[PDB]
Amino acid sequence: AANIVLAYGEWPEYCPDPTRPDVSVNRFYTLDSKMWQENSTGWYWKFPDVLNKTGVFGQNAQFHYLYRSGFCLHVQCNASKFHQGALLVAVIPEFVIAGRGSNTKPNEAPHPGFTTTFPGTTGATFHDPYVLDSGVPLSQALIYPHQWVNLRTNNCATVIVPYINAVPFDSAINHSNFGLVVVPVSPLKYSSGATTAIPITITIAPLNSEFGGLRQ
Amino acid sequence: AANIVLAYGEWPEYCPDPTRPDVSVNRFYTLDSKMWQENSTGWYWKFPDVLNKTGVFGQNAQFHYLYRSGFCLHVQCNASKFHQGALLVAVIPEFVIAGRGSNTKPNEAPHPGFTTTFPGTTGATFHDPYVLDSGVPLSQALIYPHQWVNLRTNNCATVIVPYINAVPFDSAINHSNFGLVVVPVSPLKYSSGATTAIPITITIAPLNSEFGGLRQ
Amino acid sequence: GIPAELRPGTNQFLTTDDDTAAPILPGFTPTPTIHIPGEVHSLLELCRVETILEVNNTTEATGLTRLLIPVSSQNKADELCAAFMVDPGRIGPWQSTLVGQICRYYTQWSGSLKVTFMFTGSFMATGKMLVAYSPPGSAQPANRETAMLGTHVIWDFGLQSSVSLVIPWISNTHFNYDYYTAGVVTLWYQTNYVVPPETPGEAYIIAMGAAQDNFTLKICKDTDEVTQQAVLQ
Amino acid sequence: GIPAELRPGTNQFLTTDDDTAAPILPGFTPTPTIHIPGEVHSLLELCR
Amino acid sequence: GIPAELRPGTNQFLTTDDDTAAPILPGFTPTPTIHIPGEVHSLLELCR
Amino acid sequence: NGVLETTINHFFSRSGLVGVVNLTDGGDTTGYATWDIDIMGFVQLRRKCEMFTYMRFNAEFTFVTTTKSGEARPYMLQYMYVPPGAPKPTGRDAFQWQTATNPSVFVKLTDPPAQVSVPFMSPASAYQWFYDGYPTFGQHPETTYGLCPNNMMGTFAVRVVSREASQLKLQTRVYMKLKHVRAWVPRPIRSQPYLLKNFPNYDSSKITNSARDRSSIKQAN
Amino acid sequence: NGVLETTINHFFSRSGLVGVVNLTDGGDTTGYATWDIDIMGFVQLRRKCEMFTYMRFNAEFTFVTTTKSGEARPYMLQYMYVPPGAPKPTGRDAFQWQTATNPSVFVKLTDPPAQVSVPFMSPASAYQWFYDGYPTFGQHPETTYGLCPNNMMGTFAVRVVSREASQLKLQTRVYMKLKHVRAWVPRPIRSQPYLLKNFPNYDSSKITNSARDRSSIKQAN
C-alpha cells in the first residue's frame, strides 16, 4: 500500500457520454497462487480472459457481446527475510506471444495454440523469458506500467490500469486487452533448510465495469 | 603602460550564464627571456601550451578536461639608447605553422613535428619569418592585435586578448587557441663595444580562468 | 494571365519536401478521434524511462542472467566488482536500454545521464560498495583509493536498497583511430559482503539508466542495428 | 514575372479532384429554377 | 485554376540570381550562434 | 536544443520507399500490376511503427516510374486506388477500371511523378499493429491469431492506357510520406530478426544477445 | 558610394563552380558517382574563405548535368545527400540508396537543373578552416595535425534510376551559392601558391616575393 502504480497517469472512467452492473461486480477475485522456485521462468495472464469463466463477472462477459472496464491488480509475495530475489510485475497492453522454433514459410510457420495464447485462469509460463516470448527485449519491459517486488524490500505491488483500446467497446471472449507478466529477473535463492517454494498471489478487482448486448 | 592593445575591442568575461579557481590562478608568470641579436629570426609561443607544464595553472590544465580563459601579455625589451631596431608583437588566433621544403604528394608531404608545432615553455624560432611560416605575407600581420616595440621609443608592449573560439570550452592540452609571434622587422644594430645581445622578456597573466572535468 | 517564370528546382521530387498533395478522397471524413491514454509527443519522453543495462554480457552467462552482476563472500574488500563505459551510442551494455537504442537513430547527442543500482540480496545481508565515475580522458581507475578521489558515492546496502548517480555531461563529437573516449563508471567493494548464518552468500546488483531533462539529440539517421533488408513475402 | 516552381502532381488528371473547369459558354445564363416540390438533399432522408 | 502565362527567362539558371531553394532538411535547427569577438561586416573595415 | 527533431511527427516524416512493382505487357493475361498498401514491407519503417501500439496518420504516395532501359517516352499511365472493400482489377481490360468510385490519376510517363494523399481509413479510431485475439465472433472452435482486417489501407493498381498492347516494360518505385502522426502507448523495440512478414514469430534456437559481448566484466574496453 | 557591394555577404554571393563529377554505367562495379562537399576545391573560393578564421553560412547547390555528346534525353536521375556521419553508397544497387534519412531529388535529365539548400551542419557554432591542435584526446604519443572532423558538410552521390544499366555517360557541374554569411577574426590573404589540398604547406626554396620588383628604389616607373 506504500506505492501504487497508476498506469499511464490516467484513472478509469465510464463511457464518455452500454450499461452498468451497479456495484454488483465490485469485489476481489483471488487467483490460484503460483509457486516460485529456483528454476521458475515466469508467468503471464491474458487479462480479460482470466475472469471469463469464473464468477459473477464471468457470467456477464460470456453472455454480453460488448465489454468495457479497467482493473486494479495486487501482487503479493510471501517469504521470509532469509529468502532473496526480485520480480518484475508489468502490465503490457496487447501482449501477443509468438511462434518460436523457427520454420519460415507461408505454410508450416508454427503459430501458437489457443491454450498457449489464452492460458485461462491458471495462466501460462514463459519458455524463454529473456525475449518475453514476444521477440522483444525484456530489459526494456520497464517502459510499460510496472513495479519491482523485491523480497529485500516491500513484498507487495499494486497497479491500476485504465481501459485502453482503439474502440470504446469490444468483445470479452475474443480480444484480450492487456496481459500481466511476472518474471523472476534475479533468481530466487535460499539457504538449505528454508522453505523451498515461495507463493505468488495475484488479486484483481474489476473496478468500473460495463456490459451490453445480452444473449438469452 | 602608456598604451595597451585591447584585442578586438572586447574584454575577457566568464561563461555567459564550468567552475572558477577563485583568485588562485591570478598572478604573473615570467618566461625565460629570449636573447635577440643581429641575425635573430623571431620567435613564437603557442599560448595555451606555454603554461601547460609549469605552475599551479599547469596542474589545473593537465588535470581538467575543459578549459576557458583570456590573457594579458606584457613584452618588455631592455636595451640602451645606442641600440636600435624594431619588433612586431602580434597575437594571431589559431596560428598554424606549415610544412616547408616542398614535396607535394598524399604521402611524403613533410608535416611539422610535435616539438615544432607545440614548442613548449621555451618557444620556437622561425625558419623564414617573411611568410611567418604560414605561407602568409607578414607585411599584412598588422591585421591581428599587435604593437610595435621600437627601441627608439617606448620599450614595452602590452596586449589583452579575450578568449576566442567557436565553442565555449575546449581542451587545454590538444588545442592551442592563439600563438604569440615576435619578429625583428628591422634588424638590431649596435656600435662596437656595446652589449651584443638584447634580452626580450614576456610576462603573461592568465586573468579570468575557468576549468572543469577534474581527473583523479 | 498572371505572368510567371519557372526557376531551377522545377519538376523535381525532393523526398524531404513538404507541400499539400491532392486528397484522393476529398469528401471523406475520417472516424473522429477518441481519448486513448498514454499518448507520446516527443521521443525524449520515451528516453527518460530507466531500463536495465547488461553489464555482464560476456560468453559465460547467456540468458536472463546477462542482466545481473554478482557479489559474493569470497571477494575480499578493496577490489573491483564491475565497470562499464558510459555512452549510449556504442556497443555494449547500453544497447539494451531505450536511451541506448534511441541514440542509434541520431548522429549527435549530449546531456546528462542517470545511472541507478538496485540490490537483490537478502534483508539480513549488509556491506558497502563504492560506485565512482571517472570523467572522459581519465583511464580505468586502478585502485579504490584513486577512485575515491573522483566523483563517488558510498552506498551501504543495509540503509538504502538503491543508489543513484548522475553523470554530469556526455556528448559525441567528430570533426577507428578516434575510438570516442568517454567516461567510465566503476563499482568497488568498500567492505566485504557480510551475511549471517543460514543465508545465501551470493547476491546480484542490477543496473539501469536513463537520460535526464537536458538530454537532446539531433541530425536523424537510420540504424545499423538491423541488417534485415525487407523480409516481406 | 512571379517566380514559380512546379511540384510533383503537375500535369495529372485525378478523377476525384475538384477545380474550376473553363465554361464552354461563358455568356450563357440558364433557365432560372422554379419551385418543384419534394426535393432530396441527403440519401438518409430516403433511407428512413 | 489561376490562369498563368510563361514569359522569356523561364527554365533558365542565372548564377547571380536570388530565390529560395528548397531546404534539404526542413526540420533541422542549427546550433545557435554564440558571441565570437571580432566580427567583420564590410571589407572596408578591413581596408583601413 | 530545438526539440522539434524529436517530436513524434518528425520521426515518421521524410518519404521513403515502401515498395516496388513491375509491369510488362503481353496485353491479356497480365497487362497490369497491383500492390497492396502495407507499411510492414521493409524492416526500417516496420521497426519504427512497431515501437508503438496505436497510431493514427495520413499517407502521401509518390509514384516514380521509369522504363527498363530507363529512358522515358510519352506513354500514358493509370493509377487506380481501390479503397478497402472494393474488388481488385482482375485483368488489363476488366470492367474494374471503369468503376467511378475507384479514384484514378492519368499521368504521362514523361511527367514529374504523380502524387496523392490518403486519409485515415480505419473504422477504428487508430490503427493497431498488435492485436491479441481472434477476428471471428462465431465461437472459433480451435493461424488466424493476431490478424485484424481493420488495418487494410486499400490497394493500388497500375496499367498502361491504350487500345492495343504496348511492348514496353516498367517498374514503379512508390515513396510514402506519413503525415499528421499521432502515436500512443509505446512498446519496446525489437531485438530479434524478423522471419514471417505479418507475424511476430522469431527463432528460438538462434536467439541473439541484445548487447555485443566483451572480454571480462571488470575490464572496460 | 553604396556600401552594399563591400558587405561580407555580397563578397561570397554569386554561385560558382565548386566541383565536377563524371558518371558512366557498366551497371555494377561503378554505376554511380560520389562527391564530398569541399569548398577548398578550387583556388579562387579557397583564397577568399581563408582570409577569415570562423565562418557560418548556408549552402545552395545547383546540379547541371549533360551527356557526353551534350544532347539530353529524358532519363531520370537521383541525387542523394548523405548528411555527415551516414555511410556512403558503395554501389549502384546497394541498399544505401533506399535509406529514408538520406534526402534525394528525382529529376529528369531534360529538366532545368535541380537545386537544394543545406543548413549550417556543424556541432560547433561556426566552421573553422584553421585549427591548431590535434583531434584526438587520447594522449597522442607523437600528419593528423590541423585536420578537424567538425568541418564535414556531407556528401552527394548520383545514380541513374533504372532496372537495367543504361549506357549513357554524364558529367555534373555543381554550382554552389553561399548564403547568410557571417565571418569573424580575419586573417591575411595568402601570398604563396598551394601545394597540398587540405594543408597550409608551401615551398620553402621557391618562395615568391609579394611585390614585383623594379629597376631602382628611387626611380618610380
Author numbering:
A (entry chain B), B (entry chain B): 97 to 113, 122 to 320
C (entry chain C): 1 to 175, 183 to 240
D (entry chain C), E (entry chain C): 1 to 48
F (entry chain A), G (entry chain A): 73 to 214, 218 to 296
Quote the paper.
Human enteroviruses from cell cultures often exist in two forms: one is infectious mature virion (also termed “F-particle”), which contains viral RNA genome, and the other is non-infectious native empty particle (NEP) (also termed “E-particle”) without viral RNA genome. In the NEP map, some surface-exposed loops, such as the GH loops of VP1 and VP3, are unresolved; additionally, residues 1–96, 112–123, and 321–324 of VP0, 1–72 and 297 of VP1, and 176–182 of VP3 are also missing in this map. According to our maps, NEP is slightly expanded compared with mature virion (157 vs. 152 Å in radius, ~3% expansion). Compared with the mature virus, NEP exhibits a 4.8° counter-clockwise rotation of the protomeric building block (VP1, VP0, and VP3) pivoting about the corner of VP3 at the icosahedral three-fold axis, and the VP1 was pushed away from quasi-three-fold axis region exhibiting a 6 Å shift towards the five-fold axis, leading to enlarged spacing between protomers. Specifically, the two-fold axis channel is markedly opened in the NEP than in mature virion (indicated by dashed rectangles in Fig. 2e, f). No density corresponding to the pocket factor was observed in the CV-A10 NEP map. In fact, the hydrophobic pocket is collapsed in the NEP compared with that in the mature virion. The volume of the pocket is significantly reduced because four residues (Ile109, Val191, Met228, and Phe231 of VP1) move inward, making it impossible to accommodate the pocket factor.
Coxsackievirus A10 (CV-A10) belongs to the enterovirus genus in the Picornaviridae family. The virus is considered one of the major causative agents of hand, foot, and mouth disease (HFMD), which is highly infectious and affects millions of young children annually. In general, enteroviral capsids are composed of 60 copies of biological protomers that are arranged in a pseudo-T = 3 icosahedral symmetry. Each protomer consists of four capsid proteins, including VP1, VP2, VP3, and VP4.
